[PDB]
């Protein structure tokens, strides 16, 4: 009698699908993997970079069955996207485990579609947790694993010996485009939070504590006379922010979140970045060598609230949000050399309406895009001037 993963895998494998995508940005073809979250609704999670700028999305099950899928939500900041299988028939969803129980050393199994070979299973262990830094602008709290992951595994499942999802394989560290034992996956808990929002809102309502900060290294610890050589250092707290109201002051070092210790500022950022607005949480602070506890509640971020690719499905490089009280959609910030600025869009603009329809908030705007007109005419206002921006 030999030990084997087969027993566990035959139950779980149907839950992992492989995704084929056709798009344009110049036509391109890509492929990856996904995981069935809701067998009924036909919800399938995957990496945003797999289904980004996609005209056609088709899902192929383990048994060979093909389906067509339509986008449901996408969050470039966390590289998590959600699609839905059209005409879901006889599917198998996977059970998610609490990623917060993971410990370096736990055994892991990776399931995906490497080089389109088909459903491929590999194994390994948790190399490390809370890894981040691959993209300082992204919310990343990666799980690291030596389990074989290559091109195609993206959006794939990373499960424990009980066949429970612990993460979604996203990227690898490879100088030759080939796995060398270092793969990263997004913690299941983060996926749980992000997808559940996409299911209801079609996007993520990004909340924030409203604090500026940076990584607490040994050097900075010396200067600030701090014990901990790691954690989130509070550079400053924004006025009228949940953090401010909570009693967080600058020069503080955050050490724990809801009891769970903090690996780094980047990790904390990713943690809360996935939690829904109004989520009540508690932080462990360290000011003047003194342990402090605080109760917080996530709020509606006034600035940098929402990216543009989340509304135009393919237009990045411009963040925007609602303005005051149904006063239109103001643009918070714009990146240079991006699809958005390519049409003129600049920071400070306030969308009054589109296609002769008034726009008070993001809901109204999205309402016009649901019509899917051939050309989009935005009636924005720069300074005291009123202009238009055309699309397509």
């Amino acid at each position: 009698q030999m030990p084997s993963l087969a027993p566990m895998l035959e139950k779980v494998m149907p839950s992992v699908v492989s995704i084929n995508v056709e798009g344009s940005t110049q036509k391109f073809m890509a492929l990856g993997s996904g995981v069935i979250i809701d067998a009924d609704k036909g919800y399938v999670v995957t990496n945003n970079h797999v289904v980004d700028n996609a005209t056609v999305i088709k899902v192929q099950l383990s048994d060979g069955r093909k389906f067509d899928a339509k986008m449901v939500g996408k969050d470039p900041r966390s590289d998590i996207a959600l699609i839905q299988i059209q005409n879901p028939k006889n599917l198998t969803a996977i059970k998610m485990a609490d990623s917060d129980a993971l410990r370096v050393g736990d055994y892991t199994v990776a399931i995906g579609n490497p080089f389109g070979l088909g459903e491929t299973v590999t194994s390994g262990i948790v190399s490390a947790l809370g890894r981040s830094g691959l993209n300082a602008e992204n919310y990343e709290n990666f799980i690291q694993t030596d389990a074989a992951i290559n091109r195609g595994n993206a959006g794939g499942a990373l499960v424990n010996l009980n066949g429970e999802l612990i993460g979604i394989n996203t990227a690898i560290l490879a100088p030759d485009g080939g796995n060398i034992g270092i793969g990263f996956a997004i913690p299941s808990n983060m996926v749980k939070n992000l997808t559940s929002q996409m299911v209801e809102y079609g996007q993520v309502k990004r909340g924030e504590l409203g604090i500026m900060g940076t990584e607490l290294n040994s050097e900075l610890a010396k200067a600030m006379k701090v014990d901990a050589q790691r954690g989130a250092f509070v550079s400053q707290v924004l006025p009228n922010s949940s953090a401010a109201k909570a009693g967080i002051k600058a020069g503080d070092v955050i050490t724990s979140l809801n009891g769970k210790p903090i690996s780094s500022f980047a990790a904390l950022r990713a943690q809360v970045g996935t939690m829904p607005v109004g989520s009540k949480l508690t932080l462990g602070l360290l000011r003047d060598g003194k342990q402090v506890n605080v109760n917080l509640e996530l709020q509606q971020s006034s600035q940098n609230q929402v990216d543009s690719s989340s509304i135009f499905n393919g237009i990045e490089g411009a963040e925007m949000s609602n303005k005051g009280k149904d006063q239109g959609v103001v643009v918070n910030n714009v990146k240079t050399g991006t699809p958005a600025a390519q049409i003129g869009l600049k920071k400070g603009d306030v969308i009054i309406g589109a296609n002769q329809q008034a726009v008070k908030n993001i809901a109204e705007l999205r309402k016009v895009l649901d019509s899917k007109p051939s050309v989009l005419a935005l009636n924005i206002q720069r300074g005291d001037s009123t202009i238009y921006l055309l699309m397509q």
Binding site: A136, N169, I172, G177, L209, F265, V272
Partner: peptide
């Protein structure tokens, strides 16, 4: 390096 398969604000 890494491939798909400063004060930050929290």
């Amino acid at each position: 390096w890494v491939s798909a398969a400063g004060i930050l604000q929290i």
